[PDB]
A paper describes a structure:
α1-Antitrypsin is the most abundant antiprotease in the human circulation. It is also the archetypal member of the serpin (serine protease inhibitor) superfamily of proteins. Serpins are characterized by a metastable native fold consisting of nine α-helices (A–I) and three β-­pleated sheets (A–C).
We have now solved the highest resolution (1.8 Å) crystal structure of α1-antitrypsin. The increased detail provides insight into the mechanism of β-sheet A expansion by delineating the hydration of a relatively hydrophobic environment around the highly conserved Trp194 residue, rendering the initial loop insertion site conformationally labile. These data nicely explain findings from previous tryptophan fluorescence studies of conformational change during polymerization. Occupancy of alternative rotameric orientations for Val216 and Ile340 became apparent during refinement. These are found on β-­strand s4C and in the hinge region between β-strand s5A and the reactive loop. Previous structures of native wild-­type α1-antitrypsin have indicated the presence of zero, one or two waters in this region. Fascinatingly, the intrinsic fluorescence spectrum of α1-antitrypsin reports the formation of both the intermediate and polymer during polymerization by a small blue shift and increased intensity attributable to Trp194. Moreover, comparison with 2.0 Å resolution structures characterizes variation in the conformational dynamics of the allosteric pocket in solution.
Residue numbers in the entry: 24 to 393
């Protein structure tokens, strides 16, 4: 995909933002779902308001034609929306607009048609009821996994955006549940907590990488996606985070070589919840959230700004991701000592969609039971 490098840069800019704020919180978000929602929104915007959004998603508008940006997203979307999908991704974006705004039909068509997204009209005159309808939409869309997403609305809200994603992947080569046991997780150099720890002896795409001073593990999911886990050497987490680049990730993805390892990887259930006005504001996207907003592609008559924009991402990592029996296979394990590679201290990860190479998720686990 032509927009993948931009999405990768966007992932890292957003990640580094969130990490710079604190190294004591788990991080999990979807560069793809956030960028898709904001590229979609830009269709309703003009001039500086429009350009700030696309530049804040790491597109250099002097270099990449807008049609290519949207064709990029639309290609990515139809990949993630395949009827077959074993990925089982649950994602949506909801726009909630004041009833009695005269809405531009082209915008509503672009949202639904091009971006296969949803737009609703609500009575923002009733703040509590609007919040309920927004939260109900998300709860319904996730058949119950995300509850009470929006906690507050400004009394002057006339436009809110909610973007949700939940993923529980199925490993192509799964862990056996019988092997999951409680183990130490080193939350710092002197402190441990107990966490459920999966383990398997297998042939892995795994390597210890000098440039990143980290172990780098790639594991495939059923459907079209790969999880990449980066385990920094003692004291090297900040180094790892600084050194990550699109080129480097591309190299790992091209490596198919496999070697024996006794892998220990925690079960995880992690969420990330982000105020996108706040977070994207630090990346330069500010006008669309301000009284200045040029949202004339959405409504021509009345003033409009985006008052509320929230992202919530939910990840489960477990042994199989399904109760179904998987395809039986056999990996040939050499008679030699496998390295023991334990994801039992803070680590960073990315999930990549295989067709486009896009960064579906990025995160950091500082403590599995936080």
């Amino acid at each position: 995909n032509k927009i993948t490098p931009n999405l990768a840069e966007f992932a890292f800019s957003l990640y580094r933002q969130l990490a710079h704020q604190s190294n004591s919180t788990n991080i999990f978000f979807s560069p793809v779902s956030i960028a898709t929602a904001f590229a979609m929104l830009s269709l309703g915007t003009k001039a500086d308001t429009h350009d700030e959004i696309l530049e804040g998603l790491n597109f250099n508008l002097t270099e990449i034609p807008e049609a290519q940006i949207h064709e990029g997203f639309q290609e990515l979307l139809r990949t993630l929306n395949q009827p077959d999908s074993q990925l089982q991704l649950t994602t949506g974006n909801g726009l909630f607009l004041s009833e009695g705004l005269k809405l531009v039909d082209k915008f509503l068509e672009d949202v639904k048609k091009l971006y296969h997204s949803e737009a609703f009209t609500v009575n923002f005159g009733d703040t509590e009821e609007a919040k309920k309808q927004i939260n109900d939409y998300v709860e319904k869309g996730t058949q119950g996994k995300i509850v009470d997403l929006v906690k507050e609305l400004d009394r002057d809200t006339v436009f809110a955006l909610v973007n949700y994603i939940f993923f529980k992947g199925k490993w192509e080569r799964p862990f056996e549940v019988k092997d999951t046991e409680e183990e130490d997780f080193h939350v710092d150099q002197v402190t441990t907590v107990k966490v459920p720890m999966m383990k398997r002896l297998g042939m892995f795409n795994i390597q210890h990488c000098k440039k990143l001073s980290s172990w780098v593990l790639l594991m495939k999911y059923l459907g079209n996606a790969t999880a990449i886990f980066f385990l920094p050497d003692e004291g090297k987490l900040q180094h790892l985070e600084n050194e990550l680049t699109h080129d480097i990730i591309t190299k790992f993805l091209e490596n198919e070589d496999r070697r024996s390892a006794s892998l220990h990887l925690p079960k995880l259930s992690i969420t990330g919840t982000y105020d996108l006005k706040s977070v994207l504001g630090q990346l330069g996207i500010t006008k669309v959230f301000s009284n200045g907003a040029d949202l004339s592609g959405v409504t021509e008559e009345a003033p409009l700004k985006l008052s509320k924009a929230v992202h919530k991402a939910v990840l489960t990592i477990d042994e199989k991701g399904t109760e179904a029996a998987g395809a039986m296979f056999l990996e040939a394990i050499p008679m030699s000592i496998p390295p023991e590679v334990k994801f039992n201290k803070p680590f960073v990860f990315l999930m990549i969609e295989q067709n486009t190479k896009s960064p579906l998720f990025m995160g950091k686990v500082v403590n599995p039971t936080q």
